[PDB]
Amino acid sequence: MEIKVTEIRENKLLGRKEIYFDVLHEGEPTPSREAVKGKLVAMLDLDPNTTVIQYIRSYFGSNVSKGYAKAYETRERMLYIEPEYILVRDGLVQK
Amino acid sequence: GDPKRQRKKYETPSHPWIKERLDRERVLKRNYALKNKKELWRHETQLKEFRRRARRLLAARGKQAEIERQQLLQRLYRLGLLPADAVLDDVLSLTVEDVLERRLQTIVYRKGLARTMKQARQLIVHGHIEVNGQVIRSPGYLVLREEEDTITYAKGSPFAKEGHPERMVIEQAK
Amino acid sequence: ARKGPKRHLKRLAAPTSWYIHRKAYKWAVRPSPGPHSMKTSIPLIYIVRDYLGYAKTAREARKILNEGKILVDGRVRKDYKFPVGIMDVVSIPETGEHYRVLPNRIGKLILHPISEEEAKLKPFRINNKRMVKGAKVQLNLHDGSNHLVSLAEKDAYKTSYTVIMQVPERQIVKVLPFEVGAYVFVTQGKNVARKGKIVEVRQFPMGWPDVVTIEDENGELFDTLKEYAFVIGKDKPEISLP
RNA sequence: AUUCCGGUUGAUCCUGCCGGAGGCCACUGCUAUGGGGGUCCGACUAAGCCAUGCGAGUCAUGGGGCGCGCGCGCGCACCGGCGGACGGCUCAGUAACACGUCGGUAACCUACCCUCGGGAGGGGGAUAACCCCGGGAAACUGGGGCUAAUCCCCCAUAGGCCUGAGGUACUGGAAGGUCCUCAGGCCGAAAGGGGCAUGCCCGCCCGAGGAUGGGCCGGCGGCCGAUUAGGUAGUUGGUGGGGUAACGGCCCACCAAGCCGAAGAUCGGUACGGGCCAUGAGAGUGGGAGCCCGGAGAUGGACACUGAGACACGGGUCCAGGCCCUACGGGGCGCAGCAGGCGCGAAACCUCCGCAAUGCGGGCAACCGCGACGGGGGGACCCCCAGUGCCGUGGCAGCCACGGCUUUUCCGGAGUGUAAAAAGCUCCGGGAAUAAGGGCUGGGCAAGGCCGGUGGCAGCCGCCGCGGUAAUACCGGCGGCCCGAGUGGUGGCCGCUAUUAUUGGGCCUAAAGCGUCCGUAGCCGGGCCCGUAAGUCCCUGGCGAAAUCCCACGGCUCAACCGUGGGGCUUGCUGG
């Protein structure tokens, strides 16, 4: 699987970076969240903590999926803003 | 009052047992490998709508009228039924065979990717045909003028290998 | 049979001046009473969430508003139902952003970006005048606000002039009168969002409102109501308009 | 597609009605693989009756206490405040300013919100919670002691209202209006509270305006009946008053006799109104349950308290009509809220998950709650896209055997998706496997002049008409045509129908000219000149919500669907 960042925004109020990216996987299934997160952080120099992946979305016939991610500075602001369900889904907190 | 329901996008014949119409539609269905009568009537209704818009816009005064005129002609050019130097009066000469020629099944046949319309339908439904960058599984997609030169076999597909048995048998004819 | 006031608003019954998807959900935010009318305003929640895109959910928008980050006319506003209207300034210092609220040629409200210097002035159209006890003069403005002046300078103000003010402290500057060569911007009607110079005024009998003729910036003339003409200058606009 | 065909005679041309052929809605027979989208599913008969569970709370930054852990932190009830008058459901009643559109209120009220100008001084009191006794089958409820507040009261000042005499500063098209001066009187505020801190945040009262939501008035528009012709008696107006938030016979005392009506009053019948919907080439005909705006109602009827707002859908009082518990003393309930049950019927779903999204209430906030809303479950609701195989050799007249290919769909698995699941989407393995019926077959009208059975019997038949021993018309088999996951039957609307005729029908003999004449209203009216500009035409301003309808572009694979923009619709009103 390969990754290609399409757009980045900075939200100075909530204190986050909002990343829109594409994921090319030709002949393979939809990649997991662990691999996408590892690659994202390894590339963009982000803390593995303070980074949550929203939807990974596949399409009818594409072999190209889309992705949205949020990168926070502090972890307290993160836990204050984001809801608990995406945190449990990503694995940064327990149910 | 009453709210709006969704209405059919096709019309039926006024009488169901006329010999001329029966023969014509039988020939067309056989030659183009159409599942049922409902498809034919869909394309005929498309054509009838085009013709009605032409008749209404013909010799009518208004900026909106000329706007609609240009929009109609450009939409037809883009669909691939008329050329760039065409006039409103050229719409009243179109037939349903044109719409039947502009669909993905017929085009996959003409382009030599299949030997028969039935084989083309099967390929399209099983997912061995890709438009410029997208797999499509509807044999009546009505390919546009800017996509007819980007139709081929899907990347992951047995037919994408030069040395496939059925691909060899298909190429036999060409 | 309804026995009291309304507290809900459905999306299909929302005003046309908004930029809102009507068939997506069933409910909309019902604006609270405030400065401007319902047909000429929009709540802050929509500006923060759907216009600028600083949030995706109303919870986030409300956190942003309650943290004290959005200013209107130079004042912190925390109510997500507070209505924002024509000639209002929306400012964000943590991003140095400044917007003026104006209408389109369709009648819908947009944000026009402006500079930090012009973001300190707001024009107010005088809608009415009153005498208040102590013999003071009260001007009633277009956003619903009021201003006091003295009896000695009452002839220097009339019911269609414009007053420019420093907005947080509300001190007056640069009165602009209604005359036959004044520059105006139209706010409502069929000729909304047009601009030009006044040519003629016409009066009528028994309640029918007065009318005004305007010349476009290229030679074309049109008419509208004198209540929909907002004076912004004498021969050259005094704010950045689109 | 601005369409026709069959049927009155021994044969013909007309008139005229019946039927066929199309679309939409409801019920139903037989049959049924998949996905997506949407404003569908006890409206038609009973606005009939209901077991059980839920559908409205929240505030510790208003107050006092009690319990649990090291003055501090957690939990419970009470006092207090805001809300509970919205949201949700139904279509009984209503032929009316109820609705729609244009206008008015200089004749009115408005807690929560915005702006400006001003204030917060001095005193007092009670009582829940708690302790000591309890009563009662329950429902409920008594006595004594003690206490606080943003609870209650008093004084003051500001302020509100009425009247009279003056001045003429403001708005407007126009002052019983606002402002200034003087006088005589009635009513009469406030929580300087809570929190942080060494001033800031949330709050309290008064005044001027706005906004939001309402109340009231007017012009115009909108079903059938004459075997319904005269109706009205506070009825129509005036003077003076009362009452109302406010104008008003709204109500009262007095003075008059007026008001509506053949251009159809009154009375009766039926009915929630509109945006819109179905159909048709259109002119037009019909309907107006589901989504939005408005109105009305909460077993039938009437009457009140509290509150900014109710004569109150999950608050109160009485009568009528039903039901439930009882220790027989007394007490309680009405699903036209979500599920669910009985009954009525031809005729309509689970006694499921969640506050993650949209919103509302409360709260400084964090957040809590919500059968609204969202998500799934069941259903031949509506629309869109597909499937039940394809290729080659040979053969027969579309199907057979031989060989090969594919996997939408089916079986199983990993990810993503989701509040959590599920569906869907990417990928892997298996395998032509796993998936067509309904009606018709004499002529309208498309397809058999084949076999057998029955024999005016049995049966068929929209209509014409078949059947009495050789049945192309009944029953079965074999063939064939139409549509096709759908296809037939019964009721209703439009069209067919120029059989309601403005466009656009007829009256010598087919239905149809009053027995004849006079004339009232109404309709139709000779030629020229001058004026006006009411109708009429052109141009421009303010209105006729959104959704729905047409077109183009864009996003879900395309589409149905959703978004951006341009036109239309709103049968029209009004200023120049």
Substitution target in C54, C69, C70, C94 with the highest count of A β-carbons within 10 Å is C54
Closest CA to C28 of C44, C17, C12, C41: C12
**How far are the Cα atoms of A67, B40, B43, B48, C160 from residue B24, in angstroms, in the given order?**
52, 11, 15, 17, 76
Listed as own residue / partner, the contacts of B25-33 with beta carbons closer than 8 Å and 24 or more positions apart are B28/B96, B28/B97, B28/B100, B32/B100, B32/B105, B32/B106, B32/B117, B33/B105, B33/B116, B33/B117, B33/B118, B33/B121
Q: Do A27 and B130 touch (CB under 8 A)?
A: no
Chain A residues whose beta carbon lies within 8 Å of the beta carbon of residue C67: 13
Q: Is A93 on the interface with C (CB under 8 A)?
A: no
Give how far Cα A6 sits from Cα of A3, A20, A21, A23, C51, Å.
Answer: 10, 6, 5, 10, 22
Instruction: Check: CB of residue A40 under 8 Å from CB of residue A80.
Output: no
- Collapse the DSSP code of A46 into the 3-class scheme (helix H, G, I; strand E, B; otherwise coil) and give the result: coil
Angle, alpha carbons B65-B71-B75 (nearest 5°): 150
Q: Give resolution, Å, one decimal.
A: 2.7
Strand order in the sheet with C221-225: C221-225, C211-215, C195-202, C183-186, C229-233
Q: Nearest 5°: CA angle at C239, between C237 and C241?
A: 85
Residue B172 to residue B174: CA distance in whole angstroms:
6
Quote the minimal CA–CA distance from C141 to chain A in Å.
34
Cα distance between residue B146 and residue B163, in whole Å: 30
Tell me the C-alpha distance between C78 and C93, whole Å: 16
CA proximity to B111, closest of B82, B153, B154, B159: B153
* C124 sits in which H/E element: strand C121-132
Alpha helices in chain B (DSSP H): 19-32, 37-57, 63-79, 96-101, 104-110, 117-126, 165-171
Paired sense of beta strands C27-28 and C195-202, if any: unpaired
Adjacent-strand bridge partners of C148: C138
Residues pairing with B68 in the sheet = none
Please indicate whether, in this complex, the C-beta atoms of C95 and A12 are within 8 angstroms of each other: yes
Nearest to C35, CA basis, from C128, C145, C195, C137: C145
Q: Terminus-to-terminus CA distance in chain C, angstroms?
A: 47
Helix residue ranges per DSSP H, C11-123 = 44-46, 58-66
SS3 C47: helix
Strand partners, A48: none
User: In this structure, what token pair is assigned to residue B142?
Assistant: 């009505």
The verdict on A62 touching B (C-beta cutoff 8 Å) is yes
How far is CA B121 from each of CA B104, B108, C12, C131, rounded to the nearest angstrom? 9, 9, 44, 85
**Letter for the amino acid at C30?**
R
Q: Among C65, C69, C73, C14, which Cα is nearest to C44's?
A: C65
C206 touches strand D (CB under 7 A): yes
Q: Which are the contacts of A45, defined by CB distance < 8 A and separation ≥ 6?
A: none
Phi, psi of B28 (to 5 degrees): -65, -45
Asked if A52 and A40 touch (Cβ cutoff 8 Å), the reply is no
CA B149/CA C48 separation, integer angstroms: 46
Contact state of B130 with A63 under an 8 Å Cβ cutoff: no
Structure tokens at C195: 């601009």
Q: How far is CA C48 from the centre of its chain?
A: 18
Taking only Cα atoms into account, the Rg of chain A, rounded to an integer number of angstroms, comes to 13
- For chain B, helix, strand, coil in percent to 5 are 55, 5, 40
3-state SS assignment for residue C9? strand
Minimum Cα–Cα distance from A62: chain B residue:
B134
